[PDB]
Structures are given as C-alpha cells and as structure tokens.
Amino acid sequence: DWLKAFYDKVAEKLKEAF
C-alpha cells in the first residue's frame, strides 16, 4: 500500500511542478 502511496505522491509532486 505504500506503493499506491508513492503513486499518488508522484502525481502530486509532478502536478505542482508542471
């Protein structure tokens, strides 16, 4: 579940970025 966690966490950082 930590991975489902790194997934949304990756789209969040990339969301702010661009």
Side-chain angles (χ1 to χ4, degrees):
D1 173 271
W2 97 277
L3 243 152
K4 166 165 245 222
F6 181 61
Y7 209 94
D8 173 282
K9 171 140 222 188
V10 96
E12 163 164 309
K13 163 173 227 226
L14 275 84
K15 162 188 243 223
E16 168 163 69
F18 55 87

